[PDB]
């Protein structure tokens, strides 16, 4: 299952669909509709379409209706009649969407064409979000996308993470179980494979390819710091050099300057960094300072 | 009105204020069901005989309403438990709080 | 004297017909961008 | 039962129907009708149709009537006279729909044509939703849709989830119990089967096909995180690499940097992640940071 | 009794009838009639018809009269003189319909033609609904519908739920006890049977057909979630795959990530899901997340 | 005078005003049954000794 988990097929991709709708059946937790004119305007549009023309000059003050935006993913090779999941998010001053029902909503693409029609019952968790829900199989595909799959004798596998070693390894793995010249790497992120002419032939070839297992090679040393959530993650290839670290309210347990032992593997790094007795908030600053000095032999990314 | 615990209390003090997110609340800040949101464009707020809350705005000859102020009626008003902070709760006596629009 | 032919100030055509757009490519994407400037 | 649970038949699909109606018989828990003019307008329309013309200038202040939207699904091969379930959702400032009765409601399609007529008694749960109910067999189909089923010698089975391996597996399964060239995969999501010419012949063929069992192949490794409900779900094909994790108020039980053991199967992953002693809210951030670093060898989806 | 409980006969269907009436004899629990002008207007109409012309300018403030809507079902092959049950629902600001009597009410069809006449005593339960009641044998059929039953040699049995396997099974069952070519399936929802020419002959044939028993075949795996009532129902064909589940305030009983054992039958699924110790409100989110991930091998419907 | 709830009250205050749909109402907005609709093109309203 390595090749499918590492790469993606060229032309097999997911698009994004968006639309506007109304959610009805709320228990008095909808829009105020005095500060969100589009809710009442679109309700009047729906009624006018259905055969009820409400007078232009009138005051409608609803409480069970909310104006929402619906987002979905158009899956690869989607055919009309299939169903997809949608996400429903409130748009103006609505308290909750607990037990609402999404009315008929056309999901447009980037090209402003309807690719799906959405309508269903929203499932809201019930510290849980109240203005956001999900409808499983809530939208039906109405339009299909032409594709070039099955045409030509080349298929590109696109690596999720760029690596010359991994690209070469996938090339050598495809060229071991599937013939001599069945794959050629084009760059650090693309492996071009030669496929038989046809549609089912390429499907069979890619089915074979996808479940093959490749031995993942060492992949860069990096320390990911998320300051907004206060988390630090170090992969296996992170090392350290011997150097001294000082920080506020931290001391040898006896001065404030603690020596960090050079470290070869990740267990040594973890032990050396835990010897400092540093909170992760302090550990982030320690890692940044060590990266500046040169003790930390890894790529420090702040996400 | 709605207590912070989530249970409903009943008051007769008629002093209300609009808080920073509309909502007519009591002087202690407790929200006054059935929820009344006042817009910022309001020039004058009128609470009617039957509890209709109408709001006048600029460039709109017709006053924009907001909601109905419903009163709770009990069958033994002597029986409510006085919580303290100008609030009464339904005891075993004065049960079945009957909501009604004022006037009927 | 008002019948003398004259050349207007804004010469040329005072309208432009929208040009039909390129045919989308068969890459499996909904977003299709014309020749980018 | 695998093929029916995995695929859908081309042309055998469900449509969405919508309509507007009135719910009567409520115990004073209907619309205020002073803030929802359409309720009284449509009640006057109904009376005028029935033979009662209420004066135009008059004040009607109802309490037992609510204006509702009715939604239903038009089932495949629906024939006139059959019954379907409908969902009734209040539209404006109605307190409840406890024991109301839905009056005659025409359910329109996308093409604004009446496909069903809805009328019945609403069932409301009784923390339960009060403005939303369901009527079983509450609508009767009045229009039928022409279809191309039974015409031609090709039928497409559309996979619910795109997979070249699964498409090839279904193709090989249909071509084992139903002849040599009875199925051909067209893409990652479509399997074209050759069916006899006729209507009952295709029904028999698809009845045979649908109950066949296919051996489901490994299907991608993915971690689904629902932040709105605070849930994390990992399938069997999720693995881990050895790396160090630090987060606020979490420590080895002795520093704040805890080593996560490489993990091959899902039990190892669960044990390694439970060794951190992390709340799911913290676990979501841990998983996101590990995906950024590269320890988590899975596809992280946020739903 | 399987065929009758699974299918319906073509042309044997129920219509919906609606009408407006007045309910009298209430103990001061009728309309206010100052906010519902149609009550007094229709009472004056009734009096004018009966021979009493109340002056146009006058104030009538009734308390024992309520304006109601009556709904009924027109049964198949209904003949004039037969009686049907009706449902009586209040229409404006009436407190109760406890012991009221429905006056003569003409029940119209969709075509605005009178098909029944309704009049009787309402039975109200007495947490019970007060503005809704039912009258058994409260309406008498006055019009009959022409039908094509008994004409032609084809009769369509329409399956309640679409299934190619079930359609084929009914076709084979009818063709076992009633001759070689007595039934042919037309689609996933229709079985066409050949009947003798005549009226009583078709009645006899359908009487034979209806009580036949068919062996119901596995029917899709689906999990129905009703968020408005907070209920989850899983049928027998629901399975699970081994995967890890994390949710708020749920832990192994010891981390927060609990492994759910792969499960083949429904008992295994129930045991695995009960091992999580999840409230149904949490179980709904768990099931949705597992459907997103892929552990849940069933069709998740939100009703 | 007709109250909003529909019951009839009685007043000796004779200060009446025309409402936005014609009609003579009390200063509080309550209608003065028996009802009186005043047309738009009215130049003068005359209430006589015999209530006409």
In DSSP notation, B71-94 reads EEE-S-GGG-EE-SSS-EE--SSS
Collect all residues with Cβ–Cβ distance below 8 Å to D272 and sequence separation of at least 6: D240, D260, D261, D263
Which three-class secondary structure state does DSSP give residue F14? coil
Q: How far is CA C10 from the centre of its chain?
A: 17
Nearest to A175 by CA among A188, A162, A184: A184
Query: Residue A234 is encoded by which pair of tokens?
Result: 């170090």
Nearest to A113 by CA among D108, D10, C32, D145: C32
Neighbours of A164 (CB within 10 A): 12
| Inter-chain CB proximity D270 and E290 less than 8 Å | no
| Inter-chain CB proximity A150 and D108 less than 8 Å | no
Q: What is the distance between the alpha carbons of residues D289 and A234, in angstroms, rounded to a whole number?
A: 9
Backbone φ/ψ region at A132: left (φ over 0), alpha (ψ -120 to 50), beta = beta
Q: What is the distance between the alpha carbons of residues E5 and D36, in angstroms, rounded to a whole number?
A: 43
Report yes or no: E100 and E24 within 8 Å, Cβ to Cβ.
yes
Q: What is the distance between the alpha carbons of residues E205 and D74, in angstroms, rounded to a whole number?
A: 31
A contacts of C28 (beta carbons < 8 Å): 11-13, 15, 76-77, 145, 147, 149
Q: What is the distance between the alpha carbons of residues D101 and D121, in angstroms, rounded to a whole number?
A: 4
Q: What is the distance between the alpha carbons of residues D151 and E98, in angstroms, rounded to a whole number?
A: 59
Residues in chain D: 303
Q: What is the distance between the alpha carbons of residues B98 and B71, in angstroms, rounded to a whole number?
A: 8
Backbone φ/ψ region at D36: left (φ over 0), alpha (ψ -120 to 50), beta = beta
Q: Look at the block and give the residue holding tokens 């006279």.
A: D81
The residue among F3, F5, F36, F37 with the most chain E CBs within 10 A of its CB, best to mutate, is F5
D contacts of E8 (beta carbons < 8 Å): 81-82
Report yes or no: A247 and A287 within 8 Å, Cβ to Cβ.
no
Neighbours of D160 (CB within 10 A): 17
B66 → chain A, closest CA residue:
A61
E contacts of F32 (beta carbons < 8 Å): none
Neighbours of E61 (CB within 10 A): 12
Nearest to E95 by CA among E66, E75, E115, E119: E66
Query: Residue D99 is encoded by which pair of tokens?
Result: 């024991």
Query: Residue E11 is encoded by which pair of tokens?
Result: 């042309």
Report yes or no: B36 and B66 within 8 Å, Cβ to Cβ.
yes
Collect all residues with Cβ–Cβ distance below 8 Å to C5 and sequence separation of at least 6: none
Query: What residues pair up with A65 in beta bridges, in sequence order?
Result: A24
Backbone φ/ψ region at E274: left (φ over 0), alpha (ψ -120 to 50), beta = alpha
Report yes or no: E92 and E36 within 8 Å, Cβ to Cβ.
yes
**Whether B53 contacts chain A with CB within 8 A:** no
Report yes or no: E196 and D92 within 8 Å, Cβ to Cβ.
no
Q: Look at the block and give the residue holding tokens 């004056």.
A: E44
Query: Residue A154 is encoded by which pair of tokens?
Result: 């080349």
Compute the radius of gyration of chain C from its Cα atoms: 21
Q: What is the distance between the alpha carbons of residues A245 and A255, in angstroms, rounded to a whole number?
A: 11
E contacts of F33 (beta carbons < 8 Å): 59
Half-sphere exposure of D58 (CA within 13 A, CB side): 19
Burial E93-113 (b: 16+ CB within 10 A, else e): bbbbbbbbebbebbbbbeeee
Q: What is the DSSP string of chain A?
A: -HHHHHEEETT---EEEEEEEEEE--SS-S--SSS-HHHHHHHHHHHHHHT----SS-----SSEEEEEEEEEE-TT--TT-EEEEEEEE-SS----TT-EEEEEEEE-TTS-EEEEEEEE-B------SSEEEEEEEEEE-------TTSSSEEEEEESS--HHHHHHHHHHHHHHS-TTSEEE-SSSEEEEE--SSSHHHHHHHHHHHT----------EEEEETTTTEEEE-TT-EE--EEEE-TT------SEEEEPPBSSHHHHHHHHHTTT--HHHHHHHHHHHHHHT-EESEEEE-
In chain F, beta strands by DSSP E: 16-19, 22-26
Report yes or no: D71 and D89 within 8 Å, Cβ to Cβ.
yes
B contacts of D32 (beta carbons < 8 Å): 68
Nearest to D87 by CA among E121, A100, B30, B42: A100
Report yes or no: A102 and A50 within 8 Å, Cβ to Cβ.
no
Burial A247-269 (b: 16+ CB within 10 A, else e): beebeeeeeeebebeebeebeeb
Resolution of the solved structure (Å): 4.1
Compute the radius of gyration of chain A from its Cα atoms: 28
Q: What is the distance between the alpha carbons of residues C5 and D122, in angstroms, rounded to a whole number?
A: 79
**Whether D32 contacts chain B with CB within 8 A:** yes
Q: Measure the CA dihedral F19/F20/F22/F27, to 10°.
A: 0
Q: What is the distance between the alpha carbons of residues D52 and D69, in angstroms, rounded to a whole number?
A: 24
Report yes or no: A300 and A238 within 8 Å, Cβ to Cβ.
no
A contacts of E227 (beta carbons < 8 Å): 98-99, 121-124, 126
Q: Measure the CA dihedral D270/D273/D274/D279, to 10°.
A: -120
Q: Is D138 exposed, middle or buried (0-12, 13-18, 19+ CB in 10 A)?
A: buried
Q: How far is CA D201 from the centre of its chain?
A: 31
Report yes or no: D195 and D248 within 8 Å, Cβ to Cβ.
no
Q: How far is CA D242 from the centre of its chain?
A: 39
Positive or negative, the CA dihedral E286, E287, E292, E297 is: positive
DSSP state of D302: E
Which three-class secondary structure state does DSSP give residue E171? helix
Compute the radius of gyration of chain E from its Cα atoms: 28
Which three-class secondary structure state does DSSP give residue E167? helix
Report yes or no: A19 and A102 within 8 Å, Cβ to Cβ.
no
Residues in chain F: 52
Q: How far is CA D65 from the centre of its chain?
A: 30
Report yes or no: F18 and F32 within 8 Å, Cβ to Cβ.
no
The H-or-E segment that residue E191 falls in is: strand E190-194
Query: Residue B77 is encoded by which pair of tokens?
Result: 């008003």
Residues in chain A: 303
| Inter-chain CB proximity F34 and E33 less than 8 Å | no
B contacts of A61 (beta carbons < 8 Å): 65-67
Q: Look at the block and give the residue holding tokens 């464009």.
A: B41
Q: Is E20 exposed, middle or buried (0-12, 13-18, 19+ CB in 10 A)?
A: buried
The CA-to-CA distance between both ends of chain B, in Å, stands at: 20
Q: What is the distance between the alpha carbons of residues D103 and A240, in angstroms, rounded to a whole number?
A: 76
The β-bridge relationship of strands A15-24 and D299-302 is: unpaired
Determination approach: cryo-EM
Q: What is the distance between the alpha carbons of residues E223 and E233, in angstroms, rounded to a whole number?
A: 6
| Inter-chain CB proximity B37 and A57 less than 8 Å | no
Neighbours of E207 (CB within 10 A): 10
Backbone angles phi, psi at D226, to 5 degrees: -110, 100
Backbone angles phi, psi at E44, to 5 degrees: -65, -35
Q: What is the distance between the alpha carbons of residues E176 and E182, in angstroms, rounded to a whole number?
A: 9
Nearest to E72 by CA among E27, E116, E8, E28: E116
Nearest to A118 by CA among A43, A16, A21: A21
Nearest to D276 by CA among D297, D238, D250, D249: D250
Query: What residues pair up with D90 in beta bridges, in sequence order?
Result: D68
Backbone angles phi, psi at D176, to 5 degrees: -100, -45
Q: Give the neighbor-by-neighbor strand order of the sheet with A190-194.
A: A7-9, A154-159, A190-194, A183-185
Neighbours of E196 (CB within 10 A): 10
Q: Is D85 exposed, middle or buried (0-12, 13-18, 19+ CB in 10 A)?
A: middle
Q: Look at the block and give the residue holding tokens 């009056």.
A: D103
Query: Residue A180 is encoded by which pair of tokens?
Result: 């001599």
A contacts of D237 (beta carbons < 8 Å): 1, 5
Neighbours of E114 (CB within 10 A): 14
The CA-to-CA distance between both ends of chain F, in Å, stands at: 17
Burial D205-219 (b: 16+ CB within 10 A, else e): bbbbbbebebebbeb
Tally: H helices and E strands in chain B: 0, 9
The CA-to-CA distance between both ends of chain A, in Å, stands at: 29
Residues in chain B: 104
**Whether E40 contacts chain D with CB within 8 A:** no
Q: Look at the block and give the residue holding tokens 């708020």.
A: E248
Q: What is the distance between the alpha carbons of residues F47 and F33, in angstroms, rounded to a whole number?
A: 15
Q: What is the distance between the alpha carbons of residues D21 and E286, in angstroms, rounded to a whole number?
A: 35
Q: Which of residues 176-195 of E touch D (CB under 8 A)?
A: 184-190
| Closest-CA distance of chain D to residue A238, Å | 9
Nearest to D47 by CA among D60, D28, D29: D60
Collect all residues with Cβ–Cβ distance below 8 Å to E222 and sequence separation of at least 6: E234, E235, E237, E238, E298, E299, E300, E301
What are the angstrom distances between the C-alpha of A237 and each of A234, B81, D127, D259, D289?
Answer: 8, 69, 52, 13, 16
Q: What is the distance between the alpha carbons of residues D81 and D84, in angstroms, rounded to a whole number?
A: 10
Q: Could you tell me which residues of chain A have a Cβ less than 8 Å from any Cβ in chain C?
A: 11-13, 15-17, 74, 76-77, 109-111, 113, 115, 145-149
Nearest to D200 by CA among E127, E191, E11, B88: E191
What are the angstrom distances between the C-alpha of E93 and each of B48, E28, E62, E125, E289?
Answer: 21, 12, 13, 19, 45
Q: What angle do CA D55, D61, D64 make, to 5 degrees?
A: 115
Report yes or no: B10 and B99 within 8 Å, Cβ to Cβ.
no
**Whether D280 contacts chain E with CB within 8 A:** yes
Q: Measure the CA dihedral E266/E268/E269/E272, to 10°.
A: 160
The residue among A19, A84, A107, A109 with the most chain C CBs within 10 A of its CB, best to mutate, is A109
Backbone angles phi, psi at A237, to 5 degrees: -85, 15
Which three-class secondary structure state does DSSP give residue F46? coil
Q: What is the DSSP string of D232-266?
A: EEE-TT-EE--EEEEETT------SEEEEPPBSSH
Q: What is the distance between the alpha carbons of residues E162 and D277, in angstroms, rounded to a whole number?
A: 49
Query: Residue E192 is encoded by which pair of tokens?
Result: 């066409």
Q: What angle do CA E194, E195, E200 make, to 5 degrees?
A: 170
Which three-class secondary structure state does DSSP give residue D7? strand
The β-bridge relationship of strands A15-24 and D239-240 is: unpaired
Report yes or no: A230 and D247 within 8 Å, Cβ to Cβ.
yes
| Inter-chain CB proximity A149 and C31 less than 8 Å | no
Q: What is the distance between the alpha carbons of residues E129 and D126, in angstroms, rounded to a whole number?
A: 12
Nearest to D71 by CA among A121, E113, A221: A121
Collect all residues with Cβ–Cβ distance below 8 Å to B64 and sequence separation of at least 6: A34, A59, B39, B54, B55, B56, B57
The residue among B54, B101, B102 with the most chain D CBs within 10 A of its CB, best to mutate, is B101
Query: Residue E52 is encoded by which pair of tokens?
Result: 């009493």
Collect all residues with Cβ–Cβ distance below 8 Å to A171 and sequence separation of at least 6: A183, A184, A185, A191
Nearest to D269 by CA among D248, D242, D289: D242
Report yes or no: A81 and D158 within 8 Å, Cβ to Cβ.
yes
Residues in chain E: 303
Q: What is the distance between the alpha carbons of residues D205 and D219, in angstroms, rounded to a whole number?
A: 28
| Inter-chain CB proximity F2 and E57 less than 8 Å | no
Q: What is the distance between the alpha carbons of residues E16 and D119, in angstroms, rounded to a whole number?
A: 7
What are the angstrom distances between the C-alpha of D154 and each of D147, D180, D199?
Answer: 14, 15, 12
């Amino acid at each position: 299952e390595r090749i499918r988990d590492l790469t993606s097929v060229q032309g097999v991709r997911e698009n994004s669909l968006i639309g506007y709708g109304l959610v009805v059946g709320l228990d008095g937790t909808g829009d105020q509709t005095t500060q969100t004119p589009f809710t009442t305007q679109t309700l009047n549009n729906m009624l006018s379409q259905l055969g009820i023309t409400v007078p232009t000059g009138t005051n409608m003050q609803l409480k069970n209706v909310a104006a929402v935006m619906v987002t979905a993913s158009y899956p690869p090779f989607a055919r009309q009649g299939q169903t997809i999941d949608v996400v429903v998010s409130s748009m103006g001053n609505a308290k909750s969407l607990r037990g609402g029902t999404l009315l008929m909503t056309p999901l447009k693409g980037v090209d402003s064409q309807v690719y799906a029609l959405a309508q269903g019952n929203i499932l809201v968790g019930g510290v849980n979000q109240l203005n956001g829900g999900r409808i499983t199989n809530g939208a039906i595909i109405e339009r299909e996308l032409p594709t070039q799959f099955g045409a030509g004798n080349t298929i590109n596998l696109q690596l999720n993470d760029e690596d010359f070693t991994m690209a070469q390894q996938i090339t050598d793995a495809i060229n071991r179980a599937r013939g001599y010249g069945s794959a050629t790497a084009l760059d650090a992120r693309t492996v071009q494979v030669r496929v038989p002419s046809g549609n089912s032939s390429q499907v069979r070839f890619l089915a074979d390819i996808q479940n093959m297992e490749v031995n993942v090679t060492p992949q860069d040393a990096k320390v990911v710091i998320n300051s907004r959530t206060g988390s630090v993650v170090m992969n296996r290839e992170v090392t350290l050099d011997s150097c001294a670290v000082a920080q506020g309210n931290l001391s040898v347990t006896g001065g404030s300057l603690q020596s960090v032992r050079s470290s070869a593997n990740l267990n040594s790094v973890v032990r050396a960094l835990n010897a400092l007795g540093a909170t992760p908030m302090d550990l982030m600053s320690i890692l940044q300072s060590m990266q500046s000095a040169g003790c930390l032999r890894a790529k420090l990314e702040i996400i | 009105v709605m207590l912070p615990d989530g249970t409903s209390a009943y008051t007769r003090d008629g002093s209300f204020q609009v808080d920073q997110n509309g909502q007519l609340v009591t002087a202690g800040g407790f929200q006054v069901q059935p929820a009344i949101t006042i817009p910022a464009n309001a020039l004058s707020i009128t609470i009617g005989r039957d509890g209709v809350v109408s709001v006048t705005q600029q460039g709109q000859a017709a006053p924009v309403q907001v909601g109905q102020l419903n009163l709770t009626t009990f069958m033994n008003d002597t029986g409510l438990e006085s919580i303290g902070e100008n609030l009464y709760i339904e005891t075993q006596s004065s049960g079945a709080p009957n909501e009604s629009t004022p006037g009927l | 004297c008002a019948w003398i032919p004259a050349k207007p100030l804004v010469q040329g055509a005072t309208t432009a017909q929208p040009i039909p757009g390129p045919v989308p490519v068969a890459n499996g994407s909904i977003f299709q961008s014309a020749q980018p400037i």
